[PDB]
Amino acid sequence: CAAPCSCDGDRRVDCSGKGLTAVPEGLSAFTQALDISMNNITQLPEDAFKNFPFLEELQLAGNDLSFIHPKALSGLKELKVLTLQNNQLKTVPSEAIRGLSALQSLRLDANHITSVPEDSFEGLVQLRHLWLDDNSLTEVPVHPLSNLPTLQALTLALNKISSIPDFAFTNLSSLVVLHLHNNKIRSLSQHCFDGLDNLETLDLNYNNLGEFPQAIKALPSLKELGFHSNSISVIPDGAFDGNPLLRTIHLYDNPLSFVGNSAFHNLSDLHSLVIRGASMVQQFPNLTGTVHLESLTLTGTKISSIPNNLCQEQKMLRTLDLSYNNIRDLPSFNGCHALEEISLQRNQIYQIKEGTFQGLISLRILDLSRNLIHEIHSRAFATLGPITNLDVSFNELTSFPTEGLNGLNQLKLVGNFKLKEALAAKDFVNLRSLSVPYAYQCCAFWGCIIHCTPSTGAFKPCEYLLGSWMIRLTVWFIFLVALFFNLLVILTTFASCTSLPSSKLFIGLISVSNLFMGIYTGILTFLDAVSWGRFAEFGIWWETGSGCKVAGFLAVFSSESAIFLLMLATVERSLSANHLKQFRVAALLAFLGATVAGCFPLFHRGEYSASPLCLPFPTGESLGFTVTLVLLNSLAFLLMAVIYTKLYCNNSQSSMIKHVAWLIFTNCIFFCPVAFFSFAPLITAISISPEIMKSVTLIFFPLPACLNPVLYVFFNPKFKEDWKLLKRRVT
Amino acid sequence: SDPRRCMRHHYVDSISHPLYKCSSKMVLLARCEGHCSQASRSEPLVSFSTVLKQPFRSSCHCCRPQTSKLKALRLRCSGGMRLTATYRYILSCHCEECNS
Amino acid sequence: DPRRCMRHHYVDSISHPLYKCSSKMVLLARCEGHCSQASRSEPLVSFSTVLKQPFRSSCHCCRPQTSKLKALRLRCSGGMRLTATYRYILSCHCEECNS
């Protein structure tokens, strides 16, 4: 052995990985394989391998070699493999490899070779493998290549070849592999592949071909063909005519527009066919002869019909994708025994018949989304047992059968609006993922690991509308007090025929507004009492019908009318501290405006559909009318306070003033809590829970409707006595 | 130098990723094939018991690799991807028993 | 061709070693020869970070096909004979070692 090597092996010396700048000395003369790659050898002197007469394999990759002496490779008559990649050879050494008649494999890739001398490759009578990729060749060396009839593999990828002339490879009768990808080829002559009768692999990817090559009708032994990532747009009718043994064709990443009808027929060895983006194709391709397909893909076309003999002719299919077409009638799929995946999304399918999916034992995945399907029979589901995924979404379904789908593991039925019935929870025991058209549909499955998409919370209860047994009691008490007290005040006020002062007048109308609020609370309590613990089948009908619209109108109309009426009362006292005629007209205008504000949300979309209570500001995750309404209410309260402050600074008169005061106050604080819950995303409000929010909204929103009359019946007495006096005197 | 002896041969194969869009590469591989002078035999084991277990003393020699090295190929795919293919390159071969 | 995978015969004295016995010679059978099919080993390629079985090797061996369980009582010079056993190859053919 010598200082810088291994020399350990069966006469196999390996010295790669060192900093040797020259061939080492002192090795055995019977070495049959030398590996001195990855070193700092830049030049080979004359007779540099005279101590290795029996060497057979030589590796010189990774060096900075840039000059080979013509007589450097002398006496290597047994050399068979020579590697010279990752070097800096500016040209192919023709006078240095002349005496290598036993050479079989030669690597010259990753160099800076840009010229091939015409005298090169003269003397290599046993060459089999040649590497010429990763170079700067601008043309095919036709003349040098007509000297190697025994060549079997050739690569010319990653170069700058623009076109292939006539009879370029007219002397290579043993070539089996040819690579021409990652070049700038944009034109092929007619007679350019003549003589390649044994060729099996052809690669033409990442080029600039503008038209489909007609020169491929000369390779009867061709099996694999690839021409993807080109600019081919039209495939001529009858293209693969002289290639009956094709098994793999790559044609994706091309702007295809038209494909001939009789173009892929009579290909018994093809196993796959994927075509995408063929916009100007309106007929199903002919496939009389191609009966060994395992995956068919035809999407983005204008195909409107499917031949009825698709499964009968061929029994090898596993996947089928026919999305993005104009298909509206589905032929019988009986016959495709081996079929497993079907994709038919984004079509015009309108019905599903009994025999559509009959005879599909191996079907596992089905996709029928965005097809506008509205009629599905009670069949075509029992024959497909082992099915896990069923995607039927964004359709016009009205009734979904639940027979034969007990083995599902993931169901998607989100997007339909006419399916208001409840799905049975006993028919989806094995189901694990669910999405439903309505939120309340999760109640049957999820309790009274599924993880349904709507994810019902406090605002979408399943059992109790109101909630706990306290809020329910709180809302029941508010309804029983406010209605009767308001009725007693109206009857006592609108009794005498004497002239009614405006101060005494506004009280009757505050009462009539409140009476309307008590009617809304009673409606809510009756609805809760009717459906106790069964807020599953009474939710969709309530929230998608006419009851919600009526209830929502009363809440908005009653709440907004009282605030506007209270504003006039404060101005009336301020003006008093003649004008009696204007006050009635003002009251009539306030009622008219309150009616418009209430009826405005009944016409637009998405509102009165956020909570089962149908209030306008149940957060409304509608940010119009709600935000608009809450801002208007805040501006009216600030003006009354200022006016009364003005009046603050500014017997019976003292009693009336004091009465109009308490209401500007009793009312202010509650509007306060509801409005604070409202501005939630700006301050985060220390992450208020949705249940405490619902409880606070229920307790406080109708709360003034019951405290306003009691501040006038018995508590804080001013003239109630007179009323009773006068009414009783009346009775 | 019988042509049918246990020796090593070279051939070229094309490597491409099955799923990711990657450019194909042409690589050189070493293969060992031939015949060995030693023959195979199987003799009945003479057991003295009530239970018999594989009573055949087999001795068969096969042409198998002796020394090899592991080299990885950097495959360049569409966009940004550096998928790596690995294989062992055969350095030498000899005849060794299949069982031992 | 005499080098093909055939069945040969031999003898062999029989005497119980663990305990004194008499000796007896029986005709056995074995296989020996070369098969026409050759052996080859080709490497495997895989794109995963973790390596796997580096090579794919095929090899044919001359191995028995059919056997008969037999027995042979002897004389161990004891209170009883203790018996033996084997398989009497009746036909032999080539088969994959790793089959």
Side-chain angles (χ1 to χ4, degrees), chain A residues 592-618:
Chain A
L592 185 142
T595 305
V596 173
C599 75
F600 176 83
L602 181 149
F603 295 138
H604 285 245
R605 304 296 293 95
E607 185 53 9
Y608 292 158
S609 298
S611 65
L613 313 173
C614 246
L615 267 174
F617 47 64

PDB file of all heavy atoms in Angstrom, chain A residues 592-618:
ATOM      1  N   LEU A 592     -95.164  56.720  13.171  1.00  0.00           N
ATOM      2  CA  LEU A 592     -94.909  56.366  11.779  1.00  0.00           C
ATOM      3  C   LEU A 592     -93.444  56.008  11.560  1.00  0.00           C
ATOM      4  O   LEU A 592     -93.131  55.040  10.858  1.00  0.00           O
ATOM      5  CB  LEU A 592     -95.334  57.516  10.863  1.00  0.00           C
ATOM      6  CG  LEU A 592     -95.255  57.305   9.349  1.00  0.00           C
ATOM      7  CD1 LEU A 592     -96.445  57.962   8.668  1.00  0.00           C
ATOM      8  CD2 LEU A 592     -93.955  57.856   8.783  1.00  0.00           C
ATOM      9  N   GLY A 593     -92.514  56.771  12.139  1.00  0.00           N
ATOM     10  CA  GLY A 593     -91.101  56.457  12.026  1.00  0.00           C
ATOM     11  C   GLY A 593     -90.721  55.163  12.715  1.00  0.00           C
ATOM     12  O   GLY A 593     -89.892  54.403  12.202  1.00  0.00           O
ATOM     13  N   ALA A 594     -91.297  54.886  13.865  1.00  0.00           N
ATOM     14  CA  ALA A 594     -91.035  53.630  14.559  1.00  0.00           C
ATOM     15  C   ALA A 594     -91.518  52.438  13.743  1.00  0.00           C
ATOM     16  O   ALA A 594     -90.853  51.397  13.703  1.00  0.00           O
ATOM     17  CB  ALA A 594     -91.695  53.643  15.938  1.00  0.00           C
ATOM     18  N   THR A 595     -92.612  52.573  13.075  1.00  0.00           N
ATOM     19  CA  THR A 595     -93.103  51.491  12.225  1.00  0.00           C
ATOM     20  C   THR A 595     -92.147  51.221  11.068  1.00  0.00           C
ATOM     21  O   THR A 595     -91.868  50.062  10.739  1.00  0.00           O
ATOM     22  CB  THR A 595     -94.499  51.826  11.700  1.00  0.00           C
ATOM     23  OG1 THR A 595     -95.367  52.125  12.800  1.00  0.00           O
ATOM     24  CG2 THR A 595     -95.070  50.650  10.919  1.00  0.00           C
ATOM     25  N   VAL A 596     -91.539  52.291  10.424  1.00  0.00           N
ATOM     26  CA  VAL A 596     -90.598  52.126   9.318  1.00  0.00           C
ATOM     27  C   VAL A 596     -89.311  51.471   9.807  1.00  0.00           C
ATOM     28  O   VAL A 596     -88.757  50.579   9.152  1.00  0.00           O
ATOM     29  CB  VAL A 596     -90.322  53.481   8.641  1.00  0.00           C
ATOM     30  CG1 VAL A 596     -89.223  53.342   7.599  1.00  0.00           C
ATOM     31  CG2 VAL A 596     -91.593  54.022   8.005  1.00  0.00           C
ATOM     32  N   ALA A 597     -88.817  51.905  10.943  1.00  0.00           N
ATOM     33  CA  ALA A 597     -87.601  51.316  11.495  1.00  0.00           C
ATOM     34  C   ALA A 597     -87.802  49.843  11.823  1.00  0.00           C
ATOM     35  O   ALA A 597     -86.897  49.025  11.622  1.00  0.00           O
ATOM     36  CB  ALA A 597     -87.159  52.090  12.737  1.00  0.00           C
ATOM     37  N   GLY A 598     -88.971  49.426  12.266  1.00  0.00           N
ATOM     38  CA  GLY A 598     -89.248  48.030  12.559  1.00  0.00           C
ATOM     39  C   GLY A 598     -89.373  47.176  11.312  1.00  0.00           C
ATOM     40  O   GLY A 598     -88.908  46.033  11.285  1.00  0.00           O
ATOM     41  N   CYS A 599     -90.013  47.709  10.248  1.00  0.00           N
ATOM     42  CA  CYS A 599     -90.251  46.940   9.033  1.00  0.00           C
ATOM     43  C   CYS A 599     -89.063  46.926   8.080  1.00  0.00           C
ATOM     44  O   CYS A 599     -89.061  46.131   7.134  1.00  0.00           O
ATOM     45  CB  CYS A 599     -91.482  47.478   8.294  1.00  0.00           C
ATOM     46  SG  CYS A 599     -91.219  49.038   7.424  1.00  0.00           S
ATOM     47  N   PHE A 600     -88.082  47.801   8.281  1.00  0.00           N
ATOM     48  CA  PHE A 600     -86.906  47.782   7.414  1.00  0.00           C
ATOM     49  C   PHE A 600     -86.164  46.450   7.440  1.00  0.00           C
ATOM     50  O   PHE A 600     -85.861  45.920   6.356  1.00  0.00           O
ATOM     51  CB  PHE A 600     -85.980  48.949   7.777  1.00  0.00           C
ATOM     52  CG  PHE A 600     -84.688  48.961   7.009  1.00  0.00           C
ATOM     53  CD1 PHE A 600     -84.629  49.507   5.738  1.00  0.00           C
ATOM     54  CD2 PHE A 600     -83.532  48.433   7.561  1.00  0.00           C
ATOM     55  CE1 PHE A 600     -83.443  49.522   5.030  1.00  0.00           C
ATOM     56  CE2 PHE A 600     -82.344  48.445   6.857  1.00  0.00           C
ATOM     57  CZ  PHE A 600     -82.299  48.990   5.591  1.00  0.00           C
ATOM     58  N   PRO A 601     -85.853  45.865   8.589  1.00  0.00           N
ATOM     59  CA  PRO A 601     -85.168  44.562   8.556  1.00  0.00           C
ATOM     60  C   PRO A 601     -86.041  43.424   8.059  1.00  0.00           C
ATOM     61  O   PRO A 601     -85.506  42.355   7.740  1.00  0.00           O
ATOM     62  CB  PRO A 601     -84.750  44.346  10.016  1.00  0.00           C
ATOM     63  CG  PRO A 601     -85.720  45.140  10.800  1.00  0.00           C
ATOM     64  CD  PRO A 601     -85.999  46.356   9.972  1.00  0.00           C
ATOM     65  N   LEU A 602     -87.312  43.605   7.851  1.00  0.00           N
ATOM     66  CA  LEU A 602     -88.112  42.416   7.433  1.00  0.00           C
ATOM     67  C   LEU A 602     -87.899  42.101   5.948  1.00  0.00           C
ATOM     68  O   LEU A 602     -88.308  41.010   5.529  1.00  0.00           O
ATOM     69  CB  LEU A 602     -89.587  42.692   7.739  1.00  0.00           C
ATOM     70  CG  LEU A 602     -90.584  41.584   7.399  1.00  0.00           C
ATOM     71  CD1 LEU A 602     -91.764  41.615   8.358  1.00  0.00           C
ATOM     72  CD2 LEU A 602     -91.073  41.711   5.964  1.00  0.00           C
ATOM     73  N   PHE A 603     -87.241  42.954   5.262  1.00  0.00           N
ATOM     74  CA  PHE A 603     -87.122  42.774   3.786  1.00  0.00           C
ATOM     75  C   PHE A 603     -85.735  42.295   3.355  1.00  0.00           C
ATOM     76  O   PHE A 603     -85.656  41.553   2.361  1.00  0.00           O
ATOM     77  CB  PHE A 603     -87.390  44.093   3.057  1.00  0.00           C
ATOM     78  CG  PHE A 603     -88.789  44.634   3.203  1.00  0.00           C
ATOM     79  CD1 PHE A 603     -89.010  45.986   3.409  1.00  0.00           C
ATOM     80  CD2 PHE A 603     -89.888  43.795   3.117  1.00  0.00           C
ATOM     81  CE1 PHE A 603     -90.296  46.483   3.538  1.00  0.00           C
ATOM     82  CE2 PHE A 603     -91.173  44.294   3.246  1.00  0.00           C
ATOM     83  CZ  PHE A 603     -91.375  45.637   3.456  1.00  0.00           C
ATOM     84  N   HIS A 604     -84.675  42.736   4.049  1.00  0.00           N
ATOM     85  CA  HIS A 604     -83.291  42.369   3.638  1.00  0.00           C
ATOM     86  C   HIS A 604     -83.007  40.938   4.109  1.00  0.00           C
ATOM     87  O   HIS A 604     -83.920  40.308   4.674  1.00  0.00           O
ATOM     88  CB  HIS A 604     -82.252  43.231   4.373  1.00  0.00           C
ATOM     89  CG  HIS A 604     -82.177  44.624   3.849  1.00  0.00           C
ATOM     90  ND1 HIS A 604     -81.050  45.117   3.225  1.00  0.00           N
ATOM     91  CD2 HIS A 604     -83.088  45.620   3.830  1.00  0.00           C
ATOM     92  CE1 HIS A 604     -81.266  46.363   2.855  1.00  0.00           C
ATOM     93  NE2 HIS A 604     -82.509  46.695   3.213  1.00  0.00           N
ATOM     94  N   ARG A 605     -81.782  40.445   3.878  1.00  0.00           N
ATOM     95  CA  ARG A 605     -81.494  38.990   3.950  1.00  0.00           C
ATOM     96  C   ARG A 605     -80.389  38.716   4.969  1.00  0.00           C
ATOM     97  O   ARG A 605     -79.455  39.530   5.048  1.00  0.00           O
ATOM     98  CB  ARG A 605     -81.085  38.486   2.564  1.00  0.00           C
ATOM     99  CG  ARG A 605     -82.111  38.764   1.475  1.00  0.00           C
ATOM    100  CD  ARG A 605     -83.420  38.031   1.704  1.00  0.00           C
ATOM    101  NE  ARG A 605     -83.285  36.586   1.574  1.00  0.00           N
ATOM    102  CZ  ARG A 605     -83.081  35.749   2.583  1.00  0.00           C
ATOM    103  NH1 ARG A 605     -82.989  36.208   3.819  1.00  0.00           N
ATOM    104  NH2 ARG A 605     -82.973  34.452   2.355  1.00  0.00           N
ATOM    105  N   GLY A 606     -80.516  37.592   5.749  1.00  0.00           N
ATOM    106  CA  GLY A 606     -79.508  37.226   6.768  1.00  0.00           C
ATOM    107  C   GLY A 606     -79.884  37.716   8.160  1.00  0.00           C
ATOM    108  O   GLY A 606     -79.284  37.225   9.138  1.00  0.00           O
ATOM    109  N   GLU A 607     -80.885  38.639   8.252  1.00  0.00           N
ATOM    110  CA  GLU A 607     -81.265  39.218   9.566  1.00  0.00           C
ATOM    111  C   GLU A 607     -82.390  38.372  10.158  1.00  0.00           C
ATOM    112  O   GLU A 607     -82.895  37.491   9.439  1.00  0.00           O
ATOM    113  CB  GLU A 607     -81.670  40.684   9.403  1.00  0.00           C
ATOM    114  CG  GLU A 607     -81.954  41.387  10.720  1.00  0.00           C
ATOM    115  CD  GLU A 607     -80.854  41.296  11.766  1.00  0.00           C
ATOM    116  OE1 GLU A 607     -79.755  40.817  11.431  1.00  0.00           O
ATOM    117  OE2 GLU A 607     -81.102  41.703  12.918  1.00  0.00           O
ATOM    118  N   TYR A 608     -82.772  38.620  11.436  1.00  0.00           N
ATOM    119  CA  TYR A 608     -83.768  37.773  12.094  1.00  0.00           C
ATOM    120  C   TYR A 608     -83.489  36.291  11.853  1.00  0.00           C
ATOM    121  O   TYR A 608     -84.398  35.459  11.865  1.00  0.00           O
ATOM    122  CB  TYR A 608     -85.188  38.136  11.651  1.00  0.00           C
ATOM    123  CG  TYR A 608     -85.662  39.493  12.120  1.00  0.00           C
ATOM    124  CD1 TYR A 608     -86.694  40.150  11.465  1.00  0.00           C
ATOM    125  CD2 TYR A 608     -85.083  40.114  13.219  1.00  0.00           C
ATOM    126  CE1 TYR A 608     -87.135  41.389  11.887  1.00  0.00           C
ATOM    127  CE2 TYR A 608     -85.518  41.353  13.650  1.00  0.00           C
ATOM    128  CZ  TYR A 608     -86.544  41.986  12.980  1.00  0.00           C
ATOM    129  OH  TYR A 608     -86.983  43.218  13.403  1.00  0.00           O
ATOM    130  N   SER A 609     -82.212  35.925  11.708  1.00  0.00           N
ATOM    131  CA  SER A 609     -81.823  34.536  11.499  1.00  0.00           C
ATOM    132  C   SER A 609     -80.520  34.222  12.224  1.00  0.00           C
ATOM    133  O   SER A 609     -79.773  33.329  11.811  1.00  0.00           O
ATOM    134  CB  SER A 609     -81.688  34.236  10.005  1.00  0.00           C
ATOM    135  OG  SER A 609     -82.922  34.424   9.333  1.00  0.00           O
ATOM    136  N   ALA A 610     -80.232  34.942  13.359  1.00  0.00           N
ATOM    137  CA  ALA A 610     -79.020  34.729  14.139  1.00  0.00           C
ATOM    138  C   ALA A 610     -79.271  34.001  15.451  1.00  0.00           C
ATOM    139  O   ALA A 610     -78.396  33.261  15.913  1.00  0.00           O
ATOM    140  CB  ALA A 610     -78.334  36.067  14.430  1.00  0.00           C
ATOM    141  N   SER A 611     -80.436  34.159  16.133  1.00  0.00           N
ATOM    142  CA  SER A 611     -80.787  33.491  17.378  1.00  0.00           C
ATOM    143  C   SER A 611     -82.254  33.082  17.336  1.00  0.00           C
ATOM    144  O   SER A 611     -83.045  33.694  16.608  1.00  0.00           O
ATOM    145  CB  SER A 611     -80.518  34.404  18.574  1.00  0.00           C
ATOM    146  OG  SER A 611     -81.355  35.546  18.539  1.00  0.00           O
ATOM    147  N   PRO A 612     -82.667  32.070  18.061  1.00  0.00           N
ATOM    148  CA  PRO A 612     -84.087  31.689  18.115  1.00  0.00           C
ATOM    149  C   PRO A 612     -85.001  32.724  18.755  1.00  0.00           C
ATOM    150  O   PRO A 612     -86.221  32.613  18.602  1.00  0.00           O
ATOM    151  CB  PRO A 612     -84.056  30.409  18.963  1.00  0.00           C
ATOM    152  CG  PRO A 612     -82.808  30.507  19.763  1.00  0.00           C
ATOM    153  CD  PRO A 612     -81.822  31.175  18.867  1.00  0.00           C
ATOM    154  N   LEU A 613     -84.470  33.747  19.432  1.00  0.00           N
ATOM    155  CA  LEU A 613     -85.260  34.823  20.014  1.00  0.00           C
ATOM    156  C   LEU A 613     -85.650  35.885  18.998  1.00  0.00           C
ATOM    157  O   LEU A 613     -86.535  36.699  19.287  1.00  0.00           O
ATOM    158  CB  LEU A 613     -84.488  35.484  21.163  1.00  0.00           C
ATOM    159  CG  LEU A 613     -83.845  34.549  22.189  1.00  0.00           C
ATOM    160  CD1 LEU A 613     -82.972  35.332  23.154  1.00  0.00           C
ATOM    161  CD2 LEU A 613     -84.905  33.763  22.942  1.00  0.00           C
ATOM    162  N   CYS A 614     -85.039  35.983  17.848  1.00  0.00           N
ATOM    163  CA  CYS A 614     -85.293  36.963  16.791  1.00  0.00           C
ATOM    164  C   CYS A 614     -85.159  38.393  17.311  1.00  0.00           C
ATOM    165  O   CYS A 614     -85.982  39.265  17.028  1.00  0.00           O
ATOM    166  CB  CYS A 614     -86.661  36.738  16.140  1.00  0.00           C
ATOM    167  SG  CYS A 614     -86.529  36.215  14.412  1.00  0.00           S
ATOM    168  N   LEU A 615     -84.142  38.664  18.043  1.00  0.00           N
ATOM    169  CA  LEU A 615     -83.909  40.067  18.447  1.00  0.00           C
ATOM    170  C   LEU A 615     -82.974  40.616  17.388  1.00  0.00           C
ATOM    171  O   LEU A 615     -82.384  39.808  16.668  1.00  0.00           O
ATOM    172  CB  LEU A 615     -83.302  40.129  19.846  1.00  0.00           C
ATOM    173  CG  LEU A 615     -84.305  40.290  20.982  1.00  0.00           C
ATOM    174  CD1 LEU A 615     -83.609  40.199  22.327  1.00  0.00           C
ATOM    175  CD2 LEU A 615     -85.042  41.610  20.849  1.00  0.00           C
ATOM    176  N   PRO A 616     -82.826  41.990  17.169  1.00  0.00           N
ATOM    177  CA  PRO A 616     -82.027  42.537  16.086  1.00  0.00           C
ATOM    178  C   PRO A 616     -80.525  42.542  16.376  1.00  0.00           C
ATOM    179  O   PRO A 616     -79.765  42.523  15.436  1.00  0.00           O
ATOM    180  CB  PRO A 616     -82.509  43.986  16.080  1.00  0.00           C
ATOM    181  CG  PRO A 616     -82.781  44.289  17.529  1.00  0.00           C
ATOM    182  CD  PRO A 616     -83.392  43.008  18.051  1.00  0.00           C
ATOM    183  N   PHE A 617     -80.240  42.635  17.675  1.00  0.00           N
ATOM    184  CA  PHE A 617     -78.806  42.751  18.030  1.00  0.00           C
ATOM    185  C   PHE A 617     -78.334  41.568  18.863  1.00  0.00           C
ATOM    186  O   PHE A 617     -77.624  41.802  19.845  1.00  0.00           O
ATOM    187  CB  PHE A 617     -78.590  44.000  18.878  1.00  0.00           C
ATOM    188  CG  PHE A 617     -79.561  44.199  20.013  1.00  0.00           C
ATOM    189  CD1 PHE A 617     -79.617  43.307  21.071  1.00  0.00           C
ATOM    190  CD2 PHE A 617     -80.400  45.300  20.035  1.00  0.00           C
ATOM    191  CE1 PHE A 617     -80.506  43.500  22.116  1.00  0.00           C
ATOM    192  CE2 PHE A 617     -81.289  45.493  21.080  1.00  0.00           C
ATOM    193  CZ  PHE A 617     -81.339  44.593  22.119  1.00  0.00           C
ATOM    194  N   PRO A 618     -78.726  40.381  18.520  1.00  0.00           N
ATOM    195  CA  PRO A 618     -78.209  39.269  19.282  1.00  0.00           C
ATOM    196  C   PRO A 618     -76.797  39.132  18.721  1.00  0.00           C
ATOM    197  O   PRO A 618     -76.529  38.150  18.061  1.00  0.00           O
ATOM    198  CB  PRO A 618     -79.123  38.095  18.930  1.00  0.00           C
ATOM    199  CG  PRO A 618     -79.618  38.428  17.534  1.00  0.00           C
ATOM    200  CD  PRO A 618     -79.592  39.941  17.424  1.00  0.00           C
TER     201      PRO A 618
END
